[PDB]
Amino acid sequence: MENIEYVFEDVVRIYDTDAQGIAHYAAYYRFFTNTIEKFIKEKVGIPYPIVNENLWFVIAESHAIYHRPVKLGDKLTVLLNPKILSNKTIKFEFKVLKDGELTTEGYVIQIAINPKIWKSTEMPKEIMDKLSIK
Amino acid sequence: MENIEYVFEDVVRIYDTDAQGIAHYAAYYRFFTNTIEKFIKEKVGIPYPIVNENLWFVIAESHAIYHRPVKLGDKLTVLLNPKILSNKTIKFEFKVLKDGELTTEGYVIQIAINPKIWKSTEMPKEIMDKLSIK
Amino acid sequence: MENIEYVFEDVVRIYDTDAQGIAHYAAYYRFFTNTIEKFIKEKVGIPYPIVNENLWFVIAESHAIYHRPVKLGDKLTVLLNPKILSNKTIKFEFKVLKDGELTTEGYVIQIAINPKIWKSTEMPKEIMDKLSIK
Amino acid sequence: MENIEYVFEDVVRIYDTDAQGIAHYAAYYRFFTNTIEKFIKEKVGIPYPIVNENLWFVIAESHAIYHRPVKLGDKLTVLLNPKILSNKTIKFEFKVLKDGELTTEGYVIQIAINPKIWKSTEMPKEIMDKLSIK
Numbered sequence: 001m002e003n004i005e006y007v008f009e010d011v012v013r014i015y016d017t018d019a020q021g022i023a024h025y026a027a028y029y030r031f032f033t034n035t036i037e038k039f040i041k042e043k044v045g046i047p048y049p050i051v052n053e054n055l056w057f058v059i060a061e062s063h064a065i066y067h068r069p070v071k072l073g074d075k076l077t078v079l080l081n082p083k084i085l086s087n088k089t090i091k092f093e094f095k096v097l098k099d100g101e102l103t104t105e106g107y108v109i110q111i112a113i114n115p116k117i118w119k120s121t122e123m124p125k126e127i128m129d130k131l132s133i134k
Numbered sequence: 135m136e137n138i139e140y141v142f143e144d145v146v147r148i149y150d151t152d153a154q155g156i157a158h159y160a161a162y163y164r165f166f167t168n169t170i171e172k173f174i175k176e177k178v179g180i181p182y183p184i185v186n187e188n189l190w191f192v193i194a195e196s197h198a199i200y201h202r203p204v205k206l207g208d209k210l211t212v213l214l215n216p217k218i219l220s221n222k223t224i225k226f227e228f229k230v231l232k233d234g235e236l237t238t239e240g241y242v243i244q245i246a247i248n249p250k251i252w253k254s255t256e257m258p259k260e261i262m263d264k265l266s267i268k
Numbered sequence: 269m270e271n272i273e274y275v276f277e278d279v280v281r282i283y284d285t286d287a288q289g290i291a292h293y294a295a296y297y298r299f300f301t302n303t304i305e306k307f308i309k310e311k312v313g314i315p316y317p318i319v320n321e322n323l324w325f326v327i328a329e330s331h332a333i334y335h336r337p338v339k340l341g342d343k344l345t346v347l348l349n350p351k352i353l354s355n356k357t358i359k360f361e362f363k364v365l366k367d368g369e370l371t372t373e374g375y376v377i378q379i380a381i382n383p384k385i386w387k388s389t390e391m392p393k394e395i396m397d398k399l400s401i402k
Numbered sequence: 403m404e405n406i407e408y409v410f411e412d413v414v415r416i417y418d419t420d421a422q423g424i425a426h427y428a429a430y431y432r433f434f435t436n437t438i439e440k441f442i443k444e445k446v447g448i449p450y451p452i453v454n455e456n457l458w459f460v461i462a463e464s465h466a467i468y469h470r471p472v473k474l475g476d477k478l479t480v481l482l483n484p485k486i487l488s489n490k491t492i493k494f495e496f497k498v499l500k501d502g503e504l505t506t507e508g509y510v511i512q513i514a515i516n517p518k519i520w521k522s523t524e525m526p527k528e529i530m531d532k533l534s535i536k
């Protein structure tokens with residue numbers, strides 16, 4: 001449980017599926033959004049992706065490779081590997097597994113911005129400090 | 135085309151379906167949201183449901199009776215009957231049809247609010263004036 | 269563990285909100301589906317809303333009143349009251365609370381069907397014996 | 403009508419946004435799915451992503467870069483560039499513009515499959531003859 005902040009688990013529900021009977025594009029975002037939110041909560045102690053009126057996180061890039069399908073009722077495990085690319089950027093890599101078998105892998109790059117001017121902004125030292133602890 | 139502001143048509147797409155192969159709960163909201171937005175645009179000339187920083191519309195109540203299923207690729211027609219219940223409230227009744235055959239009917243009650251205090255607020259006369267014209 | 273099948277807790281997420289800063293129409297479906305799904309699992313011990321190839325639950329009617337908004341981060345408690353209307357239809361009444369104040373109330377009505385012919389069907393006694401308790 | 407199959411226009415809706423006041427991850431799927439669906443209809447004359455019981459398209463990989471945000475009400479133009487990678491896989495590259503400035507770029511890769519066995523399958527010549535034009 002030492003790395004538990006990097007592990008998120010849940011089941012595929014009706015609203016994660018479309019008529020092809022497999023999880024859909026937006027369902028993977030719920031899964032990886034839940035994983036990043038927990039991580040930040042437990043590692044940093046702050047809300048995500050809206051931290052405050054002067055600091056938000058927005059997605060600058062996204063990628064996913066869907067190796068295998070996941071169906072309604074599958075218990076998924078998501079594994080997170082955050083990489084701090086700068087005082088403005090984080091790549092959250094993730095893997096999705098069913099019973100230890102990889103189904104999906106990808107990443108999202110998020111940028112810290114001050115939403116009032118809507119430009120990128122350097123993350124406070126407190127947050128960087130928390131983020132550097134494995 | 136005189137009542138065209140009350141008529142909205144579109145097809146059911148992949149993302150309106152879940153694994154039961156029929157349109158899902160949120161897909162009807164896209165359909166009825168598109169219908170109300172067009173109506174307000176053409177009848178009133180303003181954006182919806184966020185009109186400005188001092189005036190928004192939020193849903194206070196909703197109802198739907200789903201008589202028949204709609205499937206991927208169905209061309210749906212939505213018919214709107216707005217009833218102005220007060221200077222603060224509108225019931226947007228709707229019907230959904232496939233080839234003239236009713237599939238769905240319901241309503242949403244929307245309230246005008248000033249979001250800065252988050253309380254109900256009376257709609258300007260200009261808007262009421264526009265809304266009263268059939 | 270008194271009435272624990274009937275109580276579900278959840279938290280408002282970024283994907284539950286729209287630009288009005290509050291939970292949107294589909295979010296409430298997320299909440300009540302989770303509540304109903306959990307109830308069925310614990311009380312009947314079966315999957316929901318697709319039980320098997322011959323037995324599905326489909327929504328016939330939905331209703332909600334939104335007394336108060338819920339926002340990103342709020343924790344919520346859904347209370348369920350299943351009402352068995354017939355050998356084949358259930359009305360799942362629900363309330364949403366926040367810090368123990370009522371924010372939302374509603375119901376969905378669900379009907380058991382055979383999806384191969386798409387007509388409603390009596391719930392098996394297996395299932396009805398278990399639902400009939402409590 | 404030069405390259406009209408490749409151009410799609412859409413508008414950002416309330417259901418395309420989250421509490422950050424901008425279009426969210428799934429919204430972009432809404433846009434590019436509509437773009438791809440329209441292209442397939444006009445170029446090949448078939449439904450997408452479910453062509454028939456023996457032929458579906460499923461996403462194998464997705465990628466996007468979000469240069470600029472889009473907001474509620476913005477009109478958008480999606481530009482499509484289909485690249486045929488094999489007898490069974492297509493890479494649908496896309497750009498999103500707003501007031502003719504680049505906001506977003508990406509691709510999804512789609513594979514033709516038989517869903518009854520769930521293995522990839524060569525696209526029929528009917529379909530490939532039509533896709534191969536332009």
Ligand SMILES: CC(C)(COP(=O)(O)OP(=O)(O)OC[C@H]1O[C@@H](n2cnc3c(N)ncnc32)[C@H](O)[C@@H]1OP(=O)(O)O)[C@H](O)C(=O)NCCC(=O)NCCS
Pocket residue numbers: 022023024025026028065066067068069070460461462463487488490491511513515520521522523
């Ligand atoms: C259908 C599926 C199993 C593919 O089945 P398969 O036939 O066993 O897959 P293969 O690995 O043989 O792929 C077939 C071809 O596609 C190619 N392919 C797979 N991924 C590719 C990609 N990312 N880019 C380009 N080509 C790709 C393979 O190289 C192979 O090429 P080939 O013509 O040289 O043989 C697929 O992996 C799948 O079900 N993925 C799940 C998709 C999903 O759930 N999508 C969710 C989107 S939200």
Ligand SMILES: CC(C)(COP(=O)(O)OP(=O)(O)OC[C@H]1O[C@@H](n2cnc3c(N)ncnc32)[C@H](O)[C@@H]1OP(=O)(O)O)[C@H](O)C(=O)NCCC(=O)NCCS
Pocket residue numbers: 156157158159160162199200201202203204326327328329353354356357377379381386387388389
């Ligand atoms: C499956 C469906 C066709 C019902 O099929 P059916 O068997 O032909 O339907 P019936 O009209 O005979 O309904 C069966 C029973 O349910 C009852 N019922 C239907 N709607 C009801 C409701 N709103 N409240 C209470 N009971 C209801 C009927 O009165 C009937 O009662 P009975 O036991 O006295 O015979 C259903 O109408 C349907 O497919 N609706 C589409 C649902 C859908 O697309 N849901 C989308 C949700 S987002």
Ligand SMILES: CC(C)(COP(=O)(O)OP(=O)(O)OC[C@H]1O[C@@H](n2cnc3c(N)ncnc32)[C@H](O)[C@@H]1OP(=O)(O)O)[C@H](O)C(=O)NCCC(=O)NCCS
Pocket residue numbers: 192193194195219220222223243245247252253254255290291292293294333334335336337338
């Ligand atoms: C904004 C909100 C608090 C209303 O604030 P309020 O100032 O207390 O508004 P009121 O309760 O006095 O109601 C406004 C008026 O419309 C009427 N009204 C409210 N709900 C109604 C309903 N469901 N049907 C018909 N009329 C209704 C009221 O009677 C009142 O009329 P009145 O002044 O003549 O008495 C509202 O309850 C709310 O925030 N709801 C939650 C919105 C939400 O989260 N939903 C969207 C998610 S899908």
Ligand SMILES: CC(C)(COP(=O)(O)OP(=O)(O)OC[C@H]1O[C@@H](n2cnc3c(N)ncnc32)[C@H](O)[C@@H]1OP(=O)(O)O)[C@H](O)C(=O)NCCC(=O)NCCS
Pocket residue numbers: 058059060061085086088089109111113118119120121424425426427428467468469470471472
């Ligand atoms: C806020 C926004 C304009 C960035 O503003 P900006 O101040 O110009 O930020 P920059 O372009 O200088 O990039 C910020 C930093 O992160 C880096 N960065 C940006 N995108 C990156 C990416 N995709 N991968 C790795 N690093 C990246 C930049 O190189 C820069 O680092 P630097 O200062 O060392 O050069 C951003 O482009 C944006 O609004 N994107 C749209 C967000 C959105 O709508 N997406 C969510 C919907 S799903």
